[PDB]
Design a protein around this ligand. Structure first.
Ligand SMILES: Nc1nc2c(ncn2[C@@H]2O[C@@H]3COP(=O)(O)O[C@H]4[C@@H](F)[C@H](n5cnc6c(N)ncnc65)O[C@@H]4COP(=O)(O)O[C@@H]2[C@@H]3O)c(=O)[nH]1
Lengths: 172, 172
């Protein structure tokens, strides 16, 4: 039942930190360039497949630009860098959306853990850990004060990813 | 018993990634500047106190320089940035060492988890989670192929931190 601690690491070490600074960072892209949506869209695939090149998972998802970096001194590292990537979502060759898009990196840790033998985590426990992680996250982000209209969880299991993201975007 | 998954996240998401590239990154600092020791020194305080300004924990530890950044495309983020900070360690006003020094950020997640109520982690379970994390890490790094003379764990409980680091440095 390792996912529960990974959900909290994900909040306490990242989301808690970048969400506050997020809308201010997005305004600055919109005003030093042309536009972009005001939430962090976090992809939770339940098969825990997390490719590194978002566009390699779907062509209709194309990288456009990096947001302005965030920096902070964290646990000895001077100027540690949180970066986020802006993606354009196409549909029938028309671009129908723009947002900050990314996977939930903890899901990568979960996949890896299920191959390494001394991690004591079976291959089959993956899908239920993925669900317990999405669930524990969702609890957190509901009560999260840092979280007020600034990120949207996108969990799914398998298909069009571009269509699946366009779904949530078209809801506000 | 959340520390075990945090140890693996720490290996699979960071150490596995930066250790390989580490000595090559250190050579480049030594040859585009004057020198620095060839291991990553990772601080594990067992009280899980992890300040952000390493020098605020001890004056005899002064920041000198950042290493050249590492970048990679990771889980949708283009050019995600791993940074590391080089510290000079003083003793009776003489600098007696230089290395890449940093805390184990998971220890920060552990501390935080023990204040948040819906994390189900008592204040008193901190010190044994800190020990289980140091232990599970040490297992990993022993068997870690990426790990061959490139990082040294420095666990401790309380005192001079500068003296404690100088201890391990003076062992090779
Ligand atoms: N997309 C995205 N995700 C992130 C980012 N930063 C954290 N998360 C995720 O948030 C959680 C809290 O992270 P935290 O730093 O507390 O723990 C980490 C940390 F100790 C260590 N580590 C990783 N990078 C490091 C670095 N540059 N310097 C020093 N240590 C580092 O490896 C652990 C596992 O990292 P990871 O698998 O990447 O997932 C992270 C955790 O689950 C981000 O910039 N982008």
């Amino acid at each position: 039942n390792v996912a529960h601690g990974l959900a909290w690491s994900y909040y306490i070490g990242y989301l808690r930190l970048i969400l506050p600074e997020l809308q201010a960072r997005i305004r600055t892209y919109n005003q030093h360039y042309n536009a972009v949506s005001q939430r962090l869209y976090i992809l939770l695939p339940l098969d825990c497949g997390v490719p590194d090149n978002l566009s390699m998972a779907d062509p209709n998802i194309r990288f456009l630009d990096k947001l302005p970096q965030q920096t902070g001194d964290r646990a000895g590292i001077k100027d540690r860098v949180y970066s986020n990537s802006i993606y354009e979502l196409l549909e029938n060759g028309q671009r129908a959306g723009t947002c900050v898009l990314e996977y939930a990196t903890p899901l990568q840790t979960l996949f890896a853990m299920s191959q390494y033998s001394q991690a004591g985590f079976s291959r089959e426990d993956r899908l239920e850990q993925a669900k317990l992680f999405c669930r524990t996250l969702e609890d957190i982000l509901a009560d999260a004060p840092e979280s007020q209209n600034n990120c949207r969880l996108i969990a799914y299991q398998e298909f069009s990813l571009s269509q699946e993201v366009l779904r949530h975007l078209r809801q506000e």
